[PDB]
Amino acid sequence: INVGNINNDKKDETYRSLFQDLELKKERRVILDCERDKVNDIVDQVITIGKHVKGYHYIIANLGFTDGDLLKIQFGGAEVSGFQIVDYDDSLVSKFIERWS
Amino acid sequence: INVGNINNDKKDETYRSLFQDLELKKERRVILDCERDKVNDIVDQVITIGKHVKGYHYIIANLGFTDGDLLKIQFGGAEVSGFQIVDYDDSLVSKFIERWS
DSSP, rough: OTTTTTGGGGGGGHHHHHHHHHTTTTTEEEOSSSSHHHHEEEEEHHHHTTTTTBBBBBEEEETTTSSOOOTTTEEESSSOOEEBBBOTSHHHHHHHHHHOO | OOOOSSOGGTTTHHHHHHHHHHHHHHHEEEEEEEEEEHHHHHHEEEEEEEHHHTTTTEEEEEEEETTSSGGTTGGGGEEEEEEEEETTSHHHHHHHHHHHH
């Protein structure tokens, strides 16, 4: 299902209707494929509609896994996973991110 | 279980441990009996910890039912109820709430 083109004027009732139709298959495995400025919004709506108990298994398919406001679904028991090209543990990457900060 | 005296410095992990022991009881019916300052905080933690899907059922035993930030457990399907002495439908009350506002 497309989620990019939903207009901002009604971006509450749309995402409700969307997941309430995802209830047809009673779906619990999901992937979100969008840049983090969409991710933050749709994740906030997910937590607000309450569908982040354990069993939902959202995969974030972007290189900005920790860049999202991830640490709120963290505690819902819904498993979460993704992909990251940044590694804060590596040498000059680490020292740069220190410096950057 | 007391919820009034939990210190503000650590008022996140305590509320996890609290409800996680109710999860050891597998509890699904709950009552809160506290003023809004406690209500809003613990309700926020409830939604953040992911225990407000349908099946949970909360009674807010204070006279400030709509005064709380109730409108963000609204969509979780967890039933909610409370007790209200205020009635916006009343004759002079409505006109005062207009005036007040």
